[PDB]
Amino acid sequence: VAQISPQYPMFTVPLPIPPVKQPRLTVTNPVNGQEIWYYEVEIKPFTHQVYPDLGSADLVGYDGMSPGPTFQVPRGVETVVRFINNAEAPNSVHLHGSFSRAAFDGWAEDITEPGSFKDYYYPNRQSARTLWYHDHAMHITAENAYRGQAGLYMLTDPAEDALNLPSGYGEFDIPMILTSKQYTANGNLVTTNGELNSFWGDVIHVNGQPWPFKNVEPRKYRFRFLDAAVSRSFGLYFADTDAIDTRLPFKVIASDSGLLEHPADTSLLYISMAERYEVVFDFSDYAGKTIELRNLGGSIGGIGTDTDYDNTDKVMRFVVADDTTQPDTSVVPANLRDVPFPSPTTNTPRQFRFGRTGPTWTINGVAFADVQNRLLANVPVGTVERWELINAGNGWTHPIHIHLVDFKVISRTSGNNARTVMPYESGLKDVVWLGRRETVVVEAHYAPFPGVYMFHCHNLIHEDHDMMAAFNATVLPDYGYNATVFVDPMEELWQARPYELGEFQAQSGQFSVQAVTERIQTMAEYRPYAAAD
Ligand SMILES: *[C@@H]1O[C@H](CO)[C@@H](O[C@@H]2O[C@H](CO)[C@@H](O[C@@H]3O[C@H](CO)[C@@H](O)[C@H](O)[C@@H]3O)[C@H](O)[C@H]2NC(C)=O)[C@H](O)[C@H]1NC(C)=O
Ligand SMILES: *[C@@H]1O[C@H](CO)[C@@H](O[C@@H]2O[C@H](CO)[C@@H](O)[C@H](O)[C@H]2NC(C)=O)[C@H](O)[C@H]1NC(C)=O
Ligand SMILES: [Cu+2]
Ligand SMILES: [Cu+2]
Ligand SMILES: [Cu+2]
Ligand SMILES: [Cu+2]
After folding, report:
1. Which of 121, 155, 202, 206 has the greatest CB tally within 10 Å of its CB?
2. Where on this chain does Cu cation 1 bind?
């Protein structure tokens, strides 16, 4: 299909890298004595230029940048972020991949209007993994993310750093935030408002950059891949600019929840919205040349339904250098980690069906906005449940995300005989792609925190209208751990707070180090994430 967005001079701009995020301070957690990093993220409108000739894009991002700044949080240390809505429409932040407490996870109605803020308290207790934070405000999540509200966040671990993979953000450890958008003639974004099926977009970006280049060295590299698009799934492969139809093969080191048990040797990476895979690519043998990362056309090989455009088969270009400026000491081992799969159950799976009821995308025929029927499962905490995710349709694809949890992919059956379980789905994830006529079952231990959590399709057009539901992690009244105050995401105690706007830049009022400090220490005392120890 012919491109709508103006013509772009491609592979002409070097790959941008989002800066890391700095905490404002630390606060002493009175329970254990440890400290707590505290960030302050403002959400403001800003204007950015993509088409080097004319026109700027009207955005709204985390700190006035899309993608928002990146978080490298060492495991163990609890972290806390204040999100300050200085924008034009409500917001609700989700840190995709953290088993936070219900009121810190980005419940779609737990929202912050402009002229207010809200503090999120994150445990940072899980395994090394790559996470991202995005808006989750009800029914406007597509457009809030489309315009810039998303970013990186890495739960790191020095133990696995003792594997000497290509290390170091920005040089051997590079982020790949894939989006797919569309622009006006004048240069501005075209709104996702009014789309009821999918917004594919005809312009491909990495780190907010349409069709860019990166010069590299003939050595192993770590690439972190994230499909942050609204509706587009990707089918990625590498090919030498001179046999563009030949797939260069690579190694997939980690999925959404972290490393797989063994590097998945592959040559084509199926990746849908919100999925994360980490790839290492030996640029060893391609010295001198110029490798191109491409996107599988034909609606991702008949897995999906995406509309392809003139230039949505190209993602970006890699220029290998003539020589390594210093040799490749980095390494990729063959055993990677022990993966804590959940102790298998044998029970019959719970069934969730993802379709539309007339014009509305539903799960088992209910729409998120339907408060009565929104809750579709009660799972007592500590339960393991297999869940069967069913896309019976031929004209829609559905990457299904479940909050709090990390699950193992048990099975996929494709009505189109298209595929079975893929080799990089052997570890742990929190998002699975239901392709055309696909049914998947996943297994996950529902632990360790009670609370009311979301699950939904991560096609933001679908999610917004209205393919999203809720499950309740249940305990008995004798449980404890203060759970009585962390199960309701709308708990009036963790809600947003108005702020006098100029007191934010003066660090007065609620932002004085002591108010900042009293509040966090107040917060810490509740021992929120203590059930994980
Ligand atoms: C999700 O599940 C949680 C439990 O994990 C539910 O919280 C529970 O809500 C019930 C209300 O039906 C509470 O029981 C009642 O509390 C009142 C107040 O003391 C008491 O007078 C009654 O005799 C009865 O015990 C229960 O304590 C509470 N449990 C916890 C741990 O908070 C929650 O309602 C569920 N959410 C949804 C949306 O259904
Ligand atoms: C449940 O929540 C309370 C609220 O913070 C936890 O902490 C104590 O709360 C009392 C007031 O209820 C304060 O006077 C104490 O100062 C708090 N403790 C500390 C060390 O400051 C309480 O510990 C929590 N219980 C569990 C089991 O997590
Ligand atoms: Cu998400
Ligand atoms: Cu999520
Ligand atoms: Cu969907
Ligand atoms: Cu979600």
Report:
1. 155
2. 94, 401
